[PDB]
Amino acid sequence: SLTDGKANASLTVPEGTSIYGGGEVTGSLLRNGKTIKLWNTDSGAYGVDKGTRLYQSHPWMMGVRKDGTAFGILFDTTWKAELSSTDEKIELKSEGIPFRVFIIDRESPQAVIRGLSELTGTMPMIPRWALGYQQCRFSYSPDSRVIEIADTFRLKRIPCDVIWMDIDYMDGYRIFTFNPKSFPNPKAVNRDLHIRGFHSAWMIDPGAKVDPNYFVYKSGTENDVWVKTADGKNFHGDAWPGAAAFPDFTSPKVNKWWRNLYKDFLAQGVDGVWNDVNEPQINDTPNKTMPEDYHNVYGFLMVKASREGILDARPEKRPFILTRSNFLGGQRYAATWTGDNGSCWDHLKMSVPMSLTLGLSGQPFSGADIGGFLFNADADLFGNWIGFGAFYPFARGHACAGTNNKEPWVFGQKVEDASRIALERRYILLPYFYTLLHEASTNGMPIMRPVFFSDPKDLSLRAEEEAFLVGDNLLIIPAFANQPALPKGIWKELDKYQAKMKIRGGAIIPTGKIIQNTTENSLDPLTLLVCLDEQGKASGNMYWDAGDGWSYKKGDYSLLQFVAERNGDKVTVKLTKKTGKYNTENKD
């Protein structure tokens, strides 16, 4: 068909097609037939049940024919469109120029995802502690809390890894400027967070408040995006500091300026950074934007600069950077983190659908907070929340605007006991989450897989959005027993807030052991979980490394292959292959 001026798109769908895609989205939208807007602003909120634009933009969908076949459609526009695609065809109708289209027709849905990365690429490797449970807080009454939350965790024996320092650590909410009674000793006095088996995570923003007595905002700059077709002067929005000003990731002059060797100033104790409210979001004037009036890559390009800067400041530790707002190739530099929540309960389930799509929208590492911002949460909500949230690709503790509670340990011992039992399960499967992190980065699809990926040929399995998969071999059912559409075949074989775990027949899962953090990691007693299939056989692999190089330039990894075969009344489990090897090796 046709399109001409406001641009548009093509691609009519066969009947019997199951439509997925859309990136970060609302509703029980595991499947589509709905229209969404590509653009947007703090449209996370009580997020929502379908038809609303949120934080990130992904113009892509993918179709599985009633067969098992799949196809992938990418409308390559950085501009501001709107996806609106019921059963009567996929069309993206946009407000810019003519755009490129890319079409995948491959044997699988799994092959469309690999294929998207083929075009769009993968996520660069994070450290193994990016796989640990994470939390934030902050408090007032004394200097801060002096953590007490880190000690609290180890006191409780609830596995945690990373502690995020939320919002306040800034002096006036002036970025890159700790608060000088917020412990003018922000030079990383948190050897504590490192001694205690922790890694730091710090918030960053794209808003600079108007003070000439700052030490960031350089107006021997120019970077601040000019407003209006020239006008002759910068756009003052209203962010966290109010009348803050914004970098223009228009051209590289601003980017070079942004990556300032920043995290080695207060630390070295800034380990990970998150970019937030970087849509960007304006507190006042008409619907949250800015003028020039292309929008949807500002966070995308804000965050590429951070990863670009952390790399300049520290050549190789692997960077661990996260952004609220992004774009379709954005996972090359960042990971989502999925939208300040509601503690409401519609949000708890919706996380499972919301985070499935992100994988199918190319983003391996997404998580929903086990509560949110909006909050108050009872035990009953959180306890259920932690039970399957402990299996998100990215897990975290959350919440805001206290007055009080939101912790793993508030809603009693029992809720805290549920929290301990979940986190202990997560950590044991670190050798399987980790290998999976590796797949997501070499080819791979979602770490957090659809039930439907088990048999793309099965119709019963297309729309199922509550139960979910972790990496082919493990099945996760969230709150309460025996449902719903589940994959056929051999699974398990055939405590309240806990999800049901099933292991696939023909599957080998590498299992490690309870650990407090990823610090005892190199030392993991290995236990291989085996479920024999219809021929009495199981196959599996493990990926492991030091945790701060990738599939290392020099090959400092082992890639292990297990086979198990039951012949007789006895089974053998063996080691088939040993790729790589590590912790040393160089070249002449």
3-state secondary structure 514-542: CCCCHHHCCCCCCEEEEECCCCCEEEEEE
Size (the chain), residues: 588
Q: Which amino acid belongs to residue 341?
A: N
Q: Which of 252, 249, 238 is nearest to 323 (CA)?
A: 249
Picking from 49, 22, 50, 27, the residue whose alpha carbon sits closest to that of residue 38 is: 22
How does DSSP classify residue 225?
P
* Residue 272 covered by a domain: yes
Spell out the SS3 assignment of 249-283.
CCCHHHHHHHCCCHHHCCCCCCCEEEECCCCCCCC
Domain assignment of residue 157, yes or no: yes
In a domain, 420, yes or no: yes
The verdict on residue 476 lying in a domain is: no
In a domain, 396, yes or no: yes
Contact 128, 430 (CB under 8 A): yes
- Tokens 């530790």 map to which residue? 317
Which pairing describes strands 527-531 and 272-275: parallel, antiparallel, or unpaired? unpaired
CB 330 within 8 A of CB 364: no
Answer positive or negative: Cα dihedral of 581, 585, 586, 588: negative
SS3 assignment, position 487 = coil
Give the whole-angstrom CA distance, residue 211 versus residue 215.
9
Helices and strands in the chain: count of H runs, count of E runs = 9, 22
Catalytic residue among 224, 340, 369, 416: 340
**Beta-carbon contacts of residue 195 (< 8 Å; ≥ 6 apart):** none
Nearest to 467 by CA among 442, 492, 445, 444: 492
Dist CA 288 CA 246 (whole Å) = 14
User: Beta strands 199-204 and 272-275: pairing type?
Assistant: parallel
The reply to whether 279 belongs to the active site is yes
Backbone discontinuities in the chain, residue before each (C to N > 2.5 A): 293, 494
Bridge-based pairing of strands 244-245 and 272-275 is: unpaired
Q: Compute the distance between CA of residue 24 and CA of residue 407 in angstroms, rounded to an integer.
A: 26
Query: What is d(CA 543, CA 554) in angstroms, rounded to the nearest whole number?
Result: 15
498, 515 contact by CB (below 8 A) = no
Phi and psi dihedrals of 165, rounded to 5?
-110, 115
- Based on its alpha-carbon atoms, the radius of gyration of the chain, rounded to whole angstroms, reads 24
Is residue 260 assigned to a domain? yes
* Cis ω before 142 (30° cut-off from 0): no
Is 340 a residue of the active site? Answer: yes
Token readout for 157 is 């024996």
Report the CATH number that the domain containing residue 387 is assigned in CATH: 3.20.20.80
C-alpha to C-alpha distances, 582 to 127, 266, 410, 547, 558, nearest whole angstrom: 16, 33, 43, 12, 7
Q: Is residue 350 part of a domain?
A: yes
Closest CA to 538 of 562, 559, 560, 510: 562
Name every residue whose Cβ is closer than 8 Å to that of residue 481 and which is 6 or more positions away in sequence: 500
CA distance 568 to 458: 33
| Residue in the block written with tokens 């990738």 | 550
Tokens matching residue 145: 């809390």
Active site residue 346: no
Burial of 536 (0-12, 13-18, 19+ CB in 10 A): middle
Indicate the number of domains in the chain: 1
Q: Which DSSP string corresponds to 433-471?
A: HHHHHHHHHHT---SEE-GGGS-TT-STTSS--SSEEET
Helix spans in 107-171 (H):
110-120, 149-156
Q: Whole-angstrom Cα distance, residue 491 to residue 500?
A: 11
What count of other Cβ atoms lies within 10 Å of the Cβ of residue 104? 21
Tokens of 197: 């088996």
Which H/E stretch holds residue 321? strand 321-323
Compute the distance between CA of residue 351 and CA of residue 25 in angstroms, rounded to an integer.
Answer: 10
Q: Cα–Cα distance between 333 and 43 in angstroms, integer?
A: 22
3-state secondary structure of 177: coil
Tell me which DSSP letter residue 545 carries: E
Concatenating the DSSP letter of every residue in 35-98 gives: EE-S--SS--SS--SSS---S-B--B--EE-SSS-EEEEEEE--S---EE--SS---B--SS--
Which of the residues 276, 369, 466, 545 is marked catalytic? 276
Catalytic option among 279, 407, 439, 472: 279
Question: Which residues contact residue 503 at a Cβ distance below 8 angstroms, ignoring those fewer than 6 apart?
Answer: 473, 474, 475, 491, 492, 509, 529, 531
In a domain, 99, yes or no: no
Quote the domain boundaries for residue 302: 129-206+252-439
